């Protein structure tokens, strides 16, 4: 945004979500990581738990 953009990239979300990620979840990670990359988020969520990935 302008005057100091404080918040993830609402755009990147629609992207990561497209794959099949929760809307309420995707955000959390996106912020935690810092709108680094679509993969970053998906990876962060798995980091915690998830014996199934790929």
Curated annotation (Swiss-Prot):
Job description of the protein: Negative regulator of YAP1 in the Hippo signaling pathway that plays a pivotal role in organ size control and tumor suppression by restricting proliferation and promoting apoptosis. The core of this pathway is composed of a kinase cascade wherein STK3/MST2 and STK4/MST1, in complex with its regulatory protein SAV1, phosphorylates and activates LATS1/2 in complex with its regulatory protein MOB1, which in turn phosphorylates and inactivates YAP1 oncoprotein and WWTR1/TAZ.
Region (Interaction with ubiquitinated AMOTL2): 10-48
Portion of the parent chain present: 98 to 138 of 1042
Domain UBA: start-end pairs: 8-48
Quaternary structure, from the entry: Interacts with and is phosphorylated by AURKA. Binds to AR. Interacts with AJUBA during mitosis and this complex regulates organization of the spindle apparatus through recruitment of gamma-tubulin to the centrosome. Interacts (via PPxY motif) with YAP1 (via WW domains). Interacts with MOB1A and MOB1B. Interacts with LIMD1, WTIP and AJUBA. Interacts with SNAI1. Interacts with WWC1, WWC2 and WWC3 (via their WW domains). Interacts (via UBA domain) with ubiquitinated AMOTL2; the interaction promotes LATS2 phosphorylation of YAP1.
Family under the similarity heading: Belongs to the protein kinase superfamily. AGC Ser/Thr protein kinase family.
Modifications made to the protein after synthesis: Autophosphorylated and phosphorylated during M-phase and the G1/S-phase of the cell cycle. Phosphorylated and activated by STK3/MST2. Phosphorylated by MAP4Ks; in parallel to STK3/MST2 and resulting to its activation. Phosphorylation by NUAK2 may regulate its activity in phosphorylation and inactivation YAP1.
Signal peptide: none
Compartment list: Cytoplasm, Cytoskeleton, Microtubule organizing center, Centrosome; Cytoplasm; Cytoplasm, Cytoskeleton, Spindle pole; Nucleus
Gene: Lats2
Domain of life: Eukaryota
Tissue: Expressed at high levels in ovary and testis and at lower levels in all other tissues examined.
The protein's name: Serine/threonine-protein kinase LATS2
């Amino acid at each position: 945004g302008s005057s100091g953009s404080s918040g993830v990239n609402r755009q990147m979300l629609q992207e990561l979500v497209n794959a099949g990620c929760d809307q309420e979840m995707a955000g959390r990670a996106l912020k935690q990581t810092g709108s680094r990359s679509i993969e970053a988020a998906l990876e962060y969520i798995s980091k915690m738990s998830g014996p199934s990935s790929g």
